[PDB]
Structure 1
Amino acid sequence: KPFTVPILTVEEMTNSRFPIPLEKLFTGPSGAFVVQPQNGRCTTDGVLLGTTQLSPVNICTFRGDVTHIAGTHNYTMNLASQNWNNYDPTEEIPAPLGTPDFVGRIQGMLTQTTRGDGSTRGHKATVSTGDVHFTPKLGSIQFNTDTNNDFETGQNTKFTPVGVVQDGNGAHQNEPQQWVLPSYSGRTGHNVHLAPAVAPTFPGEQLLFFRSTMPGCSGYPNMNLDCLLPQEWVQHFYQEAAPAQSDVALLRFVNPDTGRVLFECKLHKSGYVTVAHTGQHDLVIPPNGYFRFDSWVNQFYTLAPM
């Protein structure tokens, strides 16, 4: 089976780290950061890595039952799996699939149905993934909400993410921090089963990022969100399971109207893209442009400069 990537254009695709569309392609130097996202991680032959799962809408959602923290507007959620089965904390994953992979405050809504009579309720809620109560690997997290009485125990409860918030007397755009992983077990333990950090290894190369702007809900948040693979590419590799014939697939980005190649890039078998460029750059592309697999090369292939 021949390897392929989707022909969907960048704006026709979805960010793999938050449920929002892609907006653009971005390249920048990453030496100052550790680039180790856990969502949007998939090998080219369809092996999911880290906390990656297949659904574009389950990214950064949580499901489970909640318990009120008396005297506050906070609730603890005991997590269930994404299909309401028991959560298994012994699975060899860093955290439940789809768990956020950055430190920040995510605002959205908590919703609940009472199974007995079908009564429902929904409240604005925020989860702070850097807080000591954020322990998804252990099966528990905390939300700050807009009620101190409405949610019931023993009832299915869902968190739908919307955007990010920034608080404090800190500098503008100081949070979220998209390249800092939460501690999935809080302070009890270190992160386990992580998808590896990625970095360019060939001279003159940088990572190529698929970038979106997260909605902001309060303050002055850093809304940039970069993923290594579109979610639709994850679904595609997962289904095709095309075997890699070398360590690097050469892709060309093509304009369909003219047939002309705009740039070329390396898709590494372990699931990330590099380009030959130095410095921060928002790539200028035709709206109908798309990526096309052209051939198998090695890690020492010299790309045409972007």
Structure 2
Amino acid sequence: VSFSVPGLVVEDMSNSRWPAQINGLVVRGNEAQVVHFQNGRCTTEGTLLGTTTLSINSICGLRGLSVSQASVADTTLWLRVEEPDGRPYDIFGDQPAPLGTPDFTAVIVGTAIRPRTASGAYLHDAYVDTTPGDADFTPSTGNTKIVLRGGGSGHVGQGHYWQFRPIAVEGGGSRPQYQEYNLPDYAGPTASNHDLAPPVAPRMPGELLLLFESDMPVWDNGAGAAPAQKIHCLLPNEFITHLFDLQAPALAEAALLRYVHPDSGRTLFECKLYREGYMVVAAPAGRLNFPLDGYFRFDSWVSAFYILSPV
């Protein structure tokens, strides 16, 4: 099985850590906080890592059956968390958390949805605090908490299927900071993480990480004063499904890709997609100034010692 990458242009593709179109290409330096994404992790061989799911609608979310408090103004909701396919989450399995679980610290605003109940369907505005400031973000233990904002009393009875779907993160002066590079405590304050997908840092000199950018919406209680935000991922969802389906064996540490712009009738730049599923370019940190209507094309397998032409 010969290797290949999707022929879709970048602005057609989507973020694998957040529900959004890709609208930017940026190069990140080797900052103190190392990239440790749990979502959007796929090898060139199509091996999924961390909490990565192929179900785009399950990304950065929680779903499962409601349960009572004792079994574990606003209204609290308790879920026994499960996988996107509906099968139960394996506590002592090979994952730090259920697939699609948020992989960063913030207060995440969104909707709590109870779609199938015979007594009638329900939804309400909700938020999930994934910072260590909240003791009850514990999806690694099999249960987690969701807060229904301003209402929801009488609707959180046990035995019903719920979903939390993300809309935005909180911003503003006295709200918890949104830190997309900061991994949460999946097991809460009392316990440790396990089976995390490995850190991403370029080994070779002169090679920096290339990230796919999206806008990150911000909630500030209707003020409209909080500063605009971004969120990033190693590979687009369309890349991940392509590789997973293909299951092509890696023939070298990296695949040399060229970014091809039909209008310009030429290649604009080239990059290295490493076996571990991240891209690098010989370029300094910061936003790349290229049109997003170009696509990546695979040309050959190269070693880690291959010297890229500057961007």
Aligned-partner Cα distance in 1 for 2:193–2:33: 18
Structure 2's unaligned 5+ residue stretches are none
Contact 2:23-2:292 within 8 A present in 1 as well: no
Aligned-partner Cα distance in 2 for 1:126–1:69: 18
Aligned-partner Cα distance in 1 for 2:273–2:86: 36
Task: Quickly say closer, same or farther: Cα 1:163–1:90, change in 2 above 3 A.
Answer: same
Residue type at the aligned position of 2:30: S
1:153 is aligned to 158
**Cα deviations by residue, 1:191-243 (Å, 9 ceiling, x for unpaired):** 11111111122222210000111111226266211100111111000000111
Residue 239 of structure 1: SS of its match in structure 2?
Answer: helix
1:262 is aligned to 268
Work out whether 1:60 is the aligned partner of 2:63: no
**Superposed counterparts of 1:1-306, under 5 Å:** 1-67=1-67, 72-113=74-115, 115-117=117-119, 119-130=120-131, 131-146=134-149, 147-151=151-155, 152-169=157-174, 175-218=177-220, 220=226, 223-280=229-286, 282-306=287-311
Residue 57 of structure 1: SS of its match in structure 2?
Answer: helix
Residue 242 of structure 2: SS of its match in structure 1?
Answer: helix
- Residue 163 of structure 1 deviates from its aligned partner by 1.0
Residue 56 of structure 2: SS of its match in structure 1?
Answer: coil
Residue type at the aligned position of 1:2: S
Aligned-partner Cα distance in 2 for 1:302–1:15: 28
Residue type at the aligned position of 2:280: T
Contact 1:164-1:221 within 8 A present in 2 as well: no
Aligned-partner Cα distance in 2 for 1:153–1:221: 39
Task: Quickly say closer, same or farther: Cα 1:114–1:294, change in 2 above 3 A.
Answer: closer
**Cα deviations by residue, 1:144-170 (Å, 9 ceiling, x for unpaired):** 213241423211111111111125437
Aligned-partner Cα distance in 1 for 2:30–2:66: 39
Contact 2:26-2:285 within 8 A present in 1 as well: no
- Residue 189 of structure 1 deviates from its aligned partner by 1.9
Contact 2:74-2:148 within 8 A present in 1 as well: no
Residue type at the aligned position of 1:216: V
Task: Quickly say closer, same or farther: Cα 1:287–1:169, change in 2 above 3 A.
Answer: closer
Identity of aligned residues (%): 43
Residue 122 of structure 1: SS of its match in structure 2?
Answer: strand
Question: What TM-score do you get using the length of structure 1 for normalisation?
Answer: 0.92
Residue 232 of structure 1: SS of its match in structure 2?
Answer: helix
Contact 1:175-1:221 within 8 A present in 2 as well: no
Residue type at the aligned position of 1:107: V
Residue 258 of structure 2: SS of its match in structure 1?
Answer: strand
Structure 1's unaligned 5+ residue stretches are none
Aligned-partner Cα distance in 1 for 2:208–2:139: 32
- Residue 28 of structure 1 deviates from its aligned partner by 2.3
Contact 1:166-1:175 within 8 A present in 2 as well: yes
**Cα deviations by residue, 1:231-263 (Å, 9 ceiling, x for unpaired):** 111100000011111001111101123331111
Aligned-partner Cα distance in 2 for 1:92–1:241: 20
- Count matched residues: 301
Aligned-partner Cα distance in 2 for 1:235–1:148: 37
Aligned-partner Cα distance in 2 for 1:87–1:221: 37
Residue 237 of structure 1: SS of its match in structure 2?
Answer: helix
Residue type at the aligned position of 2:229: M
Aligned-partner Cα distance in 2 for 1:244–1:113: 42
Aligned-partner Cα distance in 1 for 2:145–2:243: 34
**Deviant stretches of 4+, over 4 Å:** 67-72
RMSD: 1.9
Residue type at the aligned position of 2:153: N
Task: Quickly say closer, same or farther: Cα 1:145–1:167, change in 2 above 3 A.
Answer: farther
